[PDB]
Amino acid sequence: GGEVPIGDPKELNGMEIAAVYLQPIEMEPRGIDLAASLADIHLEADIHALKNNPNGFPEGFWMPYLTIAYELKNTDTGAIKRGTLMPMVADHGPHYGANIAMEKDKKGGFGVGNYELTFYISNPEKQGFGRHVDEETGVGKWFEPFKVDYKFKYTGTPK
Amino acid sequence: GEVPIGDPKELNGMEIAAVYLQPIEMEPRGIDLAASLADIHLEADIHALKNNPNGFPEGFWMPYLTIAYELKNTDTGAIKRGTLMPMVADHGPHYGANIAMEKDKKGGFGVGNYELTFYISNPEKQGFGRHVDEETGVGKWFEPFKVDYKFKYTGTPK
């Protein structure tokens, strides 16, 4: 009753990529992300290694150091907003999330309506995450930047 | 293969072990010392314990931590200091770094007994956040601390 799934999970590049959203969350350290008071939801991305991950992460492990930009398109008003989700941890493990202003957005067009959510994923090497490339203990190349799309209906803050 | 270092510590809800292998070719090329100019690849295995106080499931890797190392040739008294960087190999993510021992031209870091010190700071310091709301929140991270290890260096393993 507090967590709202978005679309269905995608399984590409050795990871299950799922989206959900909550009420806006108070997150420390404060100041990095939108204050909970100024947001309407807290969009999150649940990304974990699939069985037989091609990059050395055991099944179920959280895929870290990923660069994830997002785009929220209200297809009914045509309004679009961009951003990036941030690594953090909660009651149920690490994830990428962000507090997002929906109806409280000043520019307008982000209230009740149908939505097209896109995650733009870039591999961890962008942030210097290392990768053994020796013959014995090396893992294969990371995926190239890709995107996944979900559809959902926004009806306000998860009450 | 994998040479263990000392015995694994357990504190602050973490499994903390120390290992070192032969020098490793790591990409992107340029962030860590080249394996050609290093004698060992020092690694640090850190995973969440059962009932982790910061919301990490049992066995999960602990990411975004800042683990600074120190190696002290107790025979020569030489002191080496640096950082371990996050990476991944054939058997999961970890923090590692290639270190120049005998090949370090400043000398004093050859064979002998060593003192390994892990300076560990919690993931916040790298912008990693945490929920602090009443429903999904988790407890505060640990304060900076240190775990010390015991190993006798014989050269590059093989």
Ligand SMILES: [Cu+2]
């Ligand atoms: Cu979050």
Ligand SMILES: [Cu+2]
């Ligand atoms: Cu390594």
